[PDB]
């Protein structure tokens, strides 16, 4: 029933509130505590309404500013969730201001607080899925560009190829590095990291195979097909490493049912 926090960022933001809810429940099992009046919660609830309203606007701005259709589809249901839970909190504060000892008002308080927790988790998760999709798009870009190696036959096209690829790789590596730090499972971290390391080591090897090929074509020594094949093998081993990374990232997410 209680939501699962998948990344370290999400855990840091939500875990403490989840703990606070449990503390309140446990506190209420003690005889000295249950029976006591819940103080006036009008103002503290007004603060929550204000923060919910801010979160919904920021989310709506995030929905109207993105190309991510999956995001545009998933966020709204989460807005409905937190708003509904917020409504319960507002109701409970009303009930508790006339009857500070209501047991059903206290239940509304806990249910509203739990609902906000899970609605916020869902929202943070959706936003996290989308960030991961951005990383996957970059990897997929690099994967596509790796096949451009097949149309490179001149030394000039090679220099262009190298100019364009190097920075794409550097950017992929940074994103993977950032991502590995969000993960809660070491299994995935080392997979991602070792794969990225292998692709980085293969780059100069690919660029060298492409050069040998161009040179051979020019100089004409007859060994052109060996050169092509070797270049293709390199592209092939790099492409498999990247596909592995894409797959681990997809495994590291897709998490919620939504989309």
């Amino acid at each position: 029933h209680m939501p699962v926090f998948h990344t370290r960022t999400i855990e840091s933001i939500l875990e403490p509130v989840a703990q606070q809810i449990s503390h309140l429940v446990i506190m209420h099992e003690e005889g000295e505590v249950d029976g006591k009046a819940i103080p006036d919660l009008t103002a503290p609830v007004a603060a929550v309404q204000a923060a919910v309203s801010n979160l919904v606007r920021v989310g709506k701005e995030t929905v109207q500013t993105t190309e991510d259709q999956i995001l545009k589809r998933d966020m709204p249901p989460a807005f409905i969730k937190v708003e509904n839970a917020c409504t319960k909190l507002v109701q409970a504060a009303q009930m508790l201001q006339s009857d500070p000892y209501s047991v059903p008002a206290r239940d509304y308080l806990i249910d509203g607080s739990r609902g906000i927790l899970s609605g916020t988790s869902d929202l943070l998760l959706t936003f996290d899925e989308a960030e991961v999709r951005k990383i996957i798009r970059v990897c997929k870009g690099i994967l596509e560009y790796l096949t451009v190696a097949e149309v490179v036959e001149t030394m000039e096209d090679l220099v262009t190829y190298t100019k364009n690829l190097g920075p794409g790789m550097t950017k992929m590596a940074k994103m993977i590095d950032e991502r590995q730090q969000e993960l809660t499972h070491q299994e995935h971290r080392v997979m991602l990291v070792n794969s990225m390391n292998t692709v980085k080591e293969l780059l100069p090897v690919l660029i060298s195979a492409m050069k040998i090929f161009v040179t051979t074509k020019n100089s004409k020594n007859q060994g052109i097909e060996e050169a092509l094949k070797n270049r293709n093998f390199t592209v092939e081993k790099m492409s498999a490493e990247i596909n592995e990374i894409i797959r681990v990232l997809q495994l590291t997410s897709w998490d919620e049912d939504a989309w």
Binding site: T9, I13, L14, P16, V17, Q20, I21, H23, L24, M27, E32, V33, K36, A37, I38, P39, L41, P44, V45, A47, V48, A50, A51, V52, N54, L55, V58, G59, T62, V82, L89, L109, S113, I116, L117, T120, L123, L124, F127
Partner: peptide, 25 residues
């Protein structure tokens, strides 16, 4: 930004739960 907005909501809910504790206990 979204992350800061969620931190603010988590903050408001924590303060609310803390205020719900009896005066005093």
């Amino acid at each position: 930004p979204l992350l800061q907005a969620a931190k603010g909501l988590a903050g408001a809910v924590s303060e609310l739960l803390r205020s719900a504790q009896p005066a005093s206990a």
